[PDB]
Amino acid sequence: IPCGKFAMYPAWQPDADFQRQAALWGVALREPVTAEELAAFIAYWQAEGKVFHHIQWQQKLARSVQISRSSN
Q: Which of residues 43-62 bind its own copies (CB under 8 A)?
A: 43-48
Which amino acid makes up residue 26?
Answer: G
Q: Count interface residues toward its own copies (CB under 8 A).
A: 23
Which amino acid makes up residue 37?
Answer: E
Q: Are 54 and 1 in contact (CB under 8 A)?
A: yes
Q: Please tell me whether residue 30 binds its own copies under the rule CB under 8 A.
A: no
Q: Please tell me whether residue 13 binds its own copies under the rule CB under 8 A.
A: no
As measured in angstroms, the least distance from the Cβ of 61 to its own copies is: 9
Q: Applying CB under 8 A, which of residues 23, 24, 28, 39 lies at the interface with its own copies?
A: 39
Contacts of 45 (CB under 8 A, 6+ apart): 8, 57, 60
